[PDB]
Amino acid sequence: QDLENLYFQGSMNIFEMLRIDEGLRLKIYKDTEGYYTIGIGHLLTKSPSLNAAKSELDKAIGRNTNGVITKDEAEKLFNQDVDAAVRGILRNAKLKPVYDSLDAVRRAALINMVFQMGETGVAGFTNSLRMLQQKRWAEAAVNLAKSRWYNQTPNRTKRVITTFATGTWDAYKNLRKKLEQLYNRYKDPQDENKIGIDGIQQFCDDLALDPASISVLIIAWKFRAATQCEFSKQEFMDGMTELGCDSIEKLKAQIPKMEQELKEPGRFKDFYQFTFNFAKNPGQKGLDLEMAIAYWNLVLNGRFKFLDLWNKFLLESIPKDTWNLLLDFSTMIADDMSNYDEEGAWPVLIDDFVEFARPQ
Numbered sequence: 001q002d003l004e005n006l007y008f009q010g011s012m013n014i015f016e017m018l019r020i021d022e023g024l025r026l027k028i029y030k031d032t033e034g035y036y037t038i039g040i041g042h043l044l045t046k047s048p049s050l051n052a053a054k055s056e057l058d059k060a061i062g063r064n065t066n067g068v069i070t071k072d073e074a075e076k077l078f079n080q081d082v083d084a085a086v087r088g089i090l091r092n093a094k095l096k097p098v099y100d101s102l103d104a105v106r107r108a109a110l111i112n113m114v115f116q117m118g119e120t121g122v123a124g125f126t127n128s129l130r131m132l133q134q135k136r137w138a139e140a141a142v143n144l145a146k147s148r149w150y151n152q153t154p155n156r157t158k159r160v161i162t163t164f165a166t167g168t169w170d171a172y173k174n175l176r177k178k179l180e181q182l183y184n185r186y187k188d189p190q191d192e193n194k195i196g197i198d199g200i201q202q203f204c205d206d207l208a209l210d211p212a213s214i215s216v217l218i219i220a221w222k223f224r225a226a227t228q229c230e231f232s233k234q235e236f237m238d239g240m241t242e243l244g245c246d247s248i249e250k251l252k253a254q255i256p257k258m259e260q261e262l263k264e265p266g267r268f269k270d271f272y273q274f275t276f277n278f279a280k281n282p283g284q285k286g287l288d289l290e291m292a293i294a295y296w297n298l299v300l301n302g303r304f305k306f307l308d309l310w311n312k313f314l315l316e317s318i319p320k321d322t323w324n325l326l327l328d329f330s331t332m333i334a335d336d337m338s339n340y341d342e343e344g345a346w347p348v349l350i351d352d353f354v355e356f357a358r359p360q
């Protein structure tokens, strides 16, 4: 599995292609269906136990990973997955003849499609597949663009189609350059690894957003930003990838869709909990009260019916558990607080708040 065994290949390859099209995650995370995954869509286990997932990962990588891997380790897992996808293509009577006929770059494009939509999806493209086998590249490209595939992921699909049309990596070289040049507009001139405050302000100005708006925090959430103070190059590239954007105009068009996600099950809670770590000083375990108040006012205004009294109470540090539980309190509390359970192991801060707020 050593990547050195692949040094004779091009530096552009199927892993790099899928890193651009589907994204790379170096820490264990839950996918859509809630399953522990890592790398480029590598499912670790269906077990609810993170410890189980870590055991599988330590097993596959051959070291104590603690749930974090390097890009090279992710490529090793991915290459195993490619090998299995290829084996399947080669048993598929519809896909084998096409695959066999293609050059290496165009084979990568076909494998990309199989990763996205499975063999049955890809096999359904009967005319386009025949065109590819006959080297009718421009016709194949025209037909593929009329599909539901194209409508679902137009930017990815356009790159894959261009790869069929040309047999070159140009669409991926162009994407990388576009993202690099966009990133360079925002990067800290003294630290190329991040965008600092001046760059975040420029980013917000380019998106026509007030930095203090909830939209900006929603963006941070979608980019999984570690801290309000900076926006790393990795975060920027991973988020633009996951959102399928290569331009500010495309990102701007995506913001309303991010905002809509907050209505899906559990997503507001995920956003709310995200806010705590994002807002806090990294060197600290807890969140300074003044900063907690600022973010509570941003995210809970119009949701927490006692927010104004909460402010008054506090104006007379916050740990993660207390932050988290305020949302639960907000959700369960009656309009008159008459259903508060003092034995519910709420934070002392909330017990004290209820005692303060009832006389008001």
Ligand SMILES: CCCCN1CCC(N(Cc2ccccc2)C(=O)Nc2ccc(Cl)c(Cl)c2)CC1
Pocket (backbone or CB within 6 Å): 197, 200, 201, 204, 211, 212, 213, 216, 217, 219, 220, 223, 225, 227, 228, 229, 230, 231, 294, 295, 298
């Ligand atoms: C409740 C009132 C909060 C007020 N401030 C707190 C700092 C916020 N901040 C840093 C920042 C951005 C632009 C201009 C000046 C400072 C950030 O939000 N960073 C940030 C960091 C990373 C990303 Cl991806 C994004 Cl979108 C934003 C913006 C809102």
